[PDB]
């Protein structure tokens, strides 16, 4: 038993990380087969970051301007191109550690593991959610761009995120692995703001089920509610609407615990209106929304 923010094992991704240096700017790249993927602002200068013309900056570069180092072995760039907001640096060595992989774009509300890297060297692993406003609340410093977010199913790494930048509020923005930003952000050092966030309701319920599975039951009650009356309370506390499809996804958890989804909703309604009254759930005094129904099943066994 026990429930923790849990990341996927990172070994398969560690062997893909490299350092990309252009001029005085260094960041990380993702080495799959004979291609290195990295954020395009590696080619930027400190001054050319308010409104860069990446198409111009890239035509003024050549293969020998890009220094790619896998550990201490230098990889020779034999080609370069731009795909939206990331670069594809052809190299003459296919990565022998290339895993079975997919490039997938995830949805707000879904989670992934982040392998934070610096100078091509992994530093740590942690679990993130894609917020409804397409930001992520990560832990990233200068030089972390190029770090990737991922999930692992069977033997396949599904890459879903490459880190690019930090917004003034401290949250982080990035692209999918095809180079298209999550959310209305651009890789320029301009004044940008994410839209107002909301709390992922289906994840909160899933976390409450994880709590029941682990012996926390004080928040249960004998009451029930309708999906309509629940959604009225959700709108008020800045919670996302709950759909019939969310109730179905929560089925398995509802079945294992014997607590009907709409009965669990009556508990959530009650926690929103009255608070926790000094108690905790799975070691938190706040309602946690960065666990998907899938994450709970992955960790909590029958």
């Amino acid at each position: 038993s026990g429930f923790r923010k849990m990341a996927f094992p990172s070994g398969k991704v560690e062997g893909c990380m490299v350092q990309v240096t252009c001029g005085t700017t260094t960041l990380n790249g993702l080495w799959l087969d004979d291609v290195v993927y990295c954020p395009r602002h590696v080619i930027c200068t400190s001054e050319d970051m308010l409104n860069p013309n990446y198409e111009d900056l890239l035509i003024r570069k050549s293969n020998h301007n890009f220094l790619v180092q896998a550990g201490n072995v230098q990889l020779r760039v034999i080609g370069h191109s731009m795909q939206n907001c990331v670069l594809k640096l052809k190299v003459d060595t296919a990565n022998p550690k290339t895993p079975k992989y997919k490039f997938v774009r995830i949805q707000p509300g879904q989670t992934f593991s982040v392998l934070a890297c610096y100078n091509g060297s992994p530093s740590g692993v942690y679990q993130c959610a894609m917020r409804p406003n397409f930001t992520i609340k990560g832990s990233f410093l200068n030089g972390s761009a190029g770090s990737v977010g991922f999930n692992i199913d069977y033997d396949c790494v599904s890459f879903c995120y490459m880190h690019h930048m930090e917004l003034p509020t401290g949250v982080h923005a990035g692209t999918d692995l095809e180079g298209n930003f999550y959310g209305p952000f651009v890789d320029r050092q301009t004044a940008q703001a994410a839209g107002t966030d909301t709390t992922i309701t289906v994840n909160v319920l899933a976390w409450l089920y994880a709590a029941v599975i682990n012996g926390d039951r004080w928040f249960l009650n004998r009451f029930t509610t309708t999906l309509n009356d629940f959604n009225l309370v959700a709108m008020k506390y800045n919670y996302e609407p709950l759909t019939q499809d969310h109730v179905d996804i929560l089925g398995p958890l509802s079945a294992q615990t014997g607590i009907a989804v709409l009965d669990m909703c009556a508990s959530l309604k009650e926690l929103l209106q009255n608070g926790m009254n000094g108690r905790t759930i799975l070691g938190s005094a706040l309602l946690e929304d960065e666990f998907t129904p899938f994450d709970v099943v992955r960790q909590c066994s029958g």
Binding site: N142, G143, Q189
Partner: peptide
Amino acid sequence: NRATLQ
């Protein structure tokens, strides 16, 4: 303040 390309 502004965004920071990292």
